[PDB]
Amino acid sequence: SENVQDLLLLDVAPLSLGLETAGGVMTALIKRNSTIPTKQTQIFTTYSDNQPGVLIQVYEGERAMTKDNNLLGRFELSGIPPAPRGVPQIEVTFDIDANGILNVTATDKSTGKANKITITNDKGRLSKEEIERMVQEAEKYKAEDEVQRERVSAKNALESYAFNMKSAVEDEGLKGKISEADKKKVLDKCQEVISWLDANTLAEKDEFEHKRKELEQVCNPIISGLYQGAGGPGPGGFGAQGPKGGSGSGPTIEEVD
């Protein structure tokens, strides 16, 4: 079901075979799922002028910039007349036969010299599992690689020294030598066309839930109590006696004797 196999049918290119072309451009001439014998003849030029020898190197997979992919083989075509940019015409005939042998012929139209390589795709690098992953990643990040790849567009070309680990010159500015610059560079956000980023305008939507209680009863204490006020008496027994009657100043009634 997921597996469907019998015989025949898979008489196609399992990989997308490409070349390192311009500096940062992988051109896949024979793309996967294309029935073999396949062929693609494309004429390339060099931006890199005055190069008497160019490097044709075959990679499998797809990336924007030629790296992170598999390498089948390479060959260096010498004979190219040291001419300006876009002048050397390299005819590259890239074809796979019925066995699955990729033959890449680079023919310099300028001189007439041709060098080819014969590579069977029956055998390969890695085991295969990694290659399948590589293809899947190439599909997966394809959109990203497409934009990246097509950002380096002008003309089909092959670049020699297409990796600046150490650049030739990169400080020609007016500094000590000619200290009068003021401004000779006016733009940055101009000259090169502006692209718009894709705004993904979608908002979220929430959900909540909150259902559980701990207070089962509502206890409301009511006053329920009585009392009795007790009272008592007091001993009110008071009375001041004053016996009198027959006491005082008592002379002999008649004075002296």
Using alpha carbons, list the distances in angstroms from residue 215 to 39, 211, 212, 219: 81, 13, 10, 10
Which method was used? Answer: NMR
Closest CA relative to residue 15, chosen from 3, 29, 2 = 29
3-state helix/strand/coil string of 148-196: HHHCCCCCCEECCCCCCCCCCCCCCCCCCCCCCCCCCCCCCCCCCCCCC
Quote the CA–CA distance of 69 and 141 in Å, as a whole number. 13
Question: Which residues, 6+ apart, have CB-to-CB distance to 40 below 8 Å?
Answer: 29, 30, 93, 94, 95
Residues in the chain: 257
Question: Token pair 């790849």 is at which residue?
Answer: 149
Q: What are phi and psi of 137, to 5 degrees?
A: -65, -35
Cα angle 148, 117, 78 (rounded to 5 degrees) comes to: 80
Question: Token pair 């204490």 is at which residue?
Answer: 221
Q: What are phi and psi of 49, to 5 degrees?
A: -80, 160
Residue 254: CB atoms within 10 A of its CB come to 6
What's the one-letter identity of residue 15?
A: L
Residue 74: CB atoms within 10 A of its CB come to 14
Q: Give Cα 188 to chain centroid, integer Å.
A: 26
All structural domains of the chain with their residue ranges: 17-158
Helices of type H across the chain: 129-140, 142-150
What is the CATH code for 17-158?
2.60.34.10
Residue 190: CB atoms within 10 A of its CB come to 8
Sheet containing 101-108: which strands, arranged edge to edge? 114-120, 101-108, 90-96, 38-46, 157-158
3-class secondary structure, 223:
coil
The count of C-alpha atoms lying within 13 angstroms of the C-alpha of 26, restricted to the half-sphere facing its C-beta, is 27
Closest CA relative to residue 37, chosen from 122, 103, 136 = 103
Quote the CA–CA distance of 225 and 182 in Å, as a whole number. 99
The token duo for 38 is: 């396949």
| Residues 1-32 as b or e (16 or more Cβ within 10 Å = b) | eeeeeeeeeeebbbbbbbbbbbbbbbbbbbeb
Using alpha carbons, list the distances in angstroms from residue 108 to 25, 79, 130, 154, 157: 20, 8, 35, 20, 13
